[PDB]
Structure formats: C-alpha cells, structure tokens
Amino acid sequence: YQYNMNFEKLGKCIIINNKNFDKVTGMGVRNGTDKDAEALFKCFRSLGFDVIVYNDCSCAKMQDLLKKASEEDHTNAACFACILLSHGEENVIYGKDGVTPIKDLTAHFRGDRCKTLLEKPKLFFIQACRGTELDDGIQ
Amino acid sequence: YKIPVEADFLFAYSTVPGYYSWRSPGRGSWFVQALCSILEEHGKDLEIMQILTRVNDRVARHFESQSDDPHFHEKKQIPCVVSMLTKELYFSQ
C-alpha cells in the first residue's frame, strides 16, 4: 500500500528557478523567487533528494533538462521530483524566451518513455499562474 | 501484467486552473512558504497527500493579498493537487 522506498537514493530533484525574462515576453522580474528556491533546496535536500537548481532557463533549456533526466538511469532511485518556479498561464509555463506546455515537460517521464521510473512516483511542484481570475474569498 | 503510461504522477500546483498565484518579493510565494514550513516539520513522518492537504489549508487560511489597486486587494488563493499515484508515499525508511 506504500511505494517501496528501499533504494540507494531517494532520487533526483530538479529546481527550475526562472527570475529574469526576455523583454519580448513582456514579463516582469519575479522578486522573491530566490528565497523560494533556496528554501526548497534545503527542504528537498533534507528529504534526501539530490537537488540541482537551474536559473533563468529558456524553453529549449527546460525541455532539454527534463528530457535528459528521463534518459538517465533511475534504477537505484526511489522517485523523481521536479520543481518549477516561473511565470505561467493555463497549461503552460514561461521560459525566459517564452512559453512551453507543461504536459510536454512531464511526458518524458511516462512509463513507456522512462522505464527506470516505472511504478515509481514522479512529482511535479509548480509555482506559477494558470490564468487571470482572482479569488475574492468569503466571510 | 501491464501498467498505464500516465500512472504514478503527482502534480502539486500552487493554484487552481484559470487563476492567479501570489508571491511576496520579501518572503517568497505563498505556496512555497507553506510547502517548506510543512515539509520542515513533517516531511519525513506524513504521507504526501496529508502534507499537501495541510499546505492547502495554510495557503487558504494564513494568506491574504494587499494592494492599493482595489481590483487586487484582499484576494485569496487555494492550491491544487493532481494525483495519479497508485500507492501511499512516505519520504522515509
């Protein structure tokens, strides 16, 4: 009833910390995101993840990073984790050069495309907007 | 025999679809603040859905926006967990 955690490593944890953006995207500096990434680095390090933080990544960079990780050998890993910190809109996330679909980033880790993470949890944490509605709250 | 290709994924979004997500320049985004606080004190002893549920609670309760623009004043946020997991997940033992 529980995922088997008896492996040499908890797993790889990729943090993409996008702060600065190409003016062509029209998006402003995400102040405070460094404090997020550092705090996330410590927490996930403390869990036992092998954490690496990449900064101000382009869409192709983000695509490549996740593609490469899916092709690595996770045989001795319990799980995989990825953290995305950026601007965004529904179904999509900003690189510094523009937007790329979230599904494309995660599809690399599908069972048929990453056998060494088969039956192992694949975690994605996403701090980003998903549209333009506001929540007024109540009471 | 077989296992679905989309299985064993989990998405912890900072907000629900269609909505904004909030970030303090001094203290960091609401979701990350809450996630780290909860992970710091319960990361190794709680199941991941319990963890993210408490994160949901703290983001929902402990946070409220302030802007001089009335369109953005006193707004709220709720995160969003999507689970295709087939097992309970503990980060220990």
Binding site: R30, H87, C129 | S14, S21, W22, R23, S65
Partner: peptide, 4 residues
C-alpha cells in the same frame, strides 16, 4: 505582493 505580486502575481505569477
């Protein structure tokens, strides 16, 4: 506070 800002929005992402």
């Amino acid at each position: 506070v800002e929005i992402x």
